[PDB]
Ligand binder design. Structure first.
Ligand SMILES: NC(=O)C1=CN([C@@H]2O[C@H](COP(=O)(O)OP(=O)(O)OC[C@H]3O[C@@H](n4cnc5c(N)ncnc54)[C@H](OP(=O)(O)O)[C@@H]3O)[C@@H](O)[C@H]2O)C=CC1
Length: 308
């Protein structure tokens, strides 16, 4: 399927353009992706520092004839704004930068609150308690006021998900998580499926740090299908039933990355990719939330509630 239907009934395109670390060509990339390559989904975040440029690209694409109703824009609220009174201001700032009246999906970027001016790695006292229930209530008010069509979360665990579901009046529409061969996170995927929550795979190519385009296992599959390794990695996500948001700042790759319809990865090869051991995680959150000397999180396991 080229799109997924969220619980709210809103459709979400299966493939989107990631914009993290997109650089100076951000605006150009977004316009090219949408017009030339047919993308109808863009994923960004306030913390990426590129939303003003993404807004310029979206504006140019709309000026080119694409209607706002046909575009799906996702953004995320950063840790420093995860306090009830800070939710609305953070979202309004994001709409201003993006030049939009509303966004289609707004995610909790990480389920941890950071003090203003927090450093990487965090100092003592800088990682604060996340009032999940109170913050989520203000996220729901964004939907009530038509500023956001759907709300979701990123980087969750099953324990955090169950806590959210006991409180939420509007359940998260989407759970966005790092997923690729070598880091399937089947555990969170199964909890989301159990509750009818759609899942979006981020860093589908293993990001740049653990990029899989040159992995021999992926190359072997790609050569037999006459597809590029990136296309095989993106198609693997769609075959698992998740949306997927590959990032490239290169027009050629932006086009390459969406040529993933009209063919499939044979089951035997899909299984080989699934067999790659889960240990290749790119984003552990250690540089953002771990201070082993003072806590509150002393290791990556503490960040993930000892679930992986
Ligand atoms: N919620 C969260 O915490 C997170 C969300 N995300 C979202 O997910 C998106 C995608 O993840 P991201 O980590 O950026 O990385 P990807 O897994 O999409 O990998 C991007 C890297 O792959 C290269 N690349 C892109 N296309 C190809 C290709 N066809 N063949 C070979 N190399 C290729 C890129 O280089 P180049 O640009 O030079 O082409 C870049 O180095 C992000 O941009 C962001 O929108 C990401 C991390 C965390």
């Amino acid at each position: 399927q080229d799109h997924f239907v969220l619980k709210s009934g809103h459709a979400m395109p299966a493939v989107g353009l990631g914009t993290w670390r997109a650089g100076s060509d951000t605006a150009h990339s977004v316009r090219t992706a949408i017009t030339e390559a047919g993308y109808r989904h863009v994923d960004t975040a306030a913390e990426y520092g590129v939303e003003k440029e993404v807004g310029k690209g979206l504006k140019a694409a709309m000026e080119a004839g694409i209607d706002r109703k046909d575009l799906f824009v996702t953004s995320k609220i950063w840790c420093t704004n995860l306090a009830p009174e800070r939710v609305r201001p953070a979202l309004e700032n994001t709409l201003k930068d993006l030049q939009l009246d509303y966004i289609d999906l707004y995610h909790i970027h990480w389920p941890f609150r950071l003090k203003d001016g927090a450093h990487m790695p965090p100092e003592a006292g800088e990682v604060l308690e996340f009032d999940m229930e109170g913050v989520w209530k203000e996220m729901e008010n964004l939907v009530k006021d038509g500023l956001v069509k759907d709300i979701g979360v990123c980087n969750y665990t099953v324990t955090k998900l169950n806590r959210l579901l006991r409180s939420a009046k509007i359940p998260p529409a989407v759970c966005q998580m790092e997923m690729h061969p070598g880091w399937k996170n089947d555990k969170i995927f199964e909890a989301c499926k159990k509750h009818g929550i759609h899942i979006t795979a981020y860093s589908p190519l293993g990001s740049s740090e653990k990029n899989l385009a040159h992995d021999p296992v992926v190359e072997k599959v790609a050569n037999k299908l006459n597809k590029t390794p990136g296309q095989v990695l993106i198609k693997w996500a769609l075959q698992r039933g998740t949306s997927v948001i590959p990032k490239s700042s290169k027009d050629e790759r932006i086009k390459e990355n969406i040529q993933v319809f009209g063919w499939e990865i044979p089951e035997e090869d899909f299984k080989v990719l699934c067999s790659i051991k889960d240990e290749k995680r790119v984003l552990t959150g250690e540089e953002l939330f771990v201070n082993k000397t003072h806590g509150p999180y002393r290791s990556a396991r503490d960040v993930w509630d000892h679930e992986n």
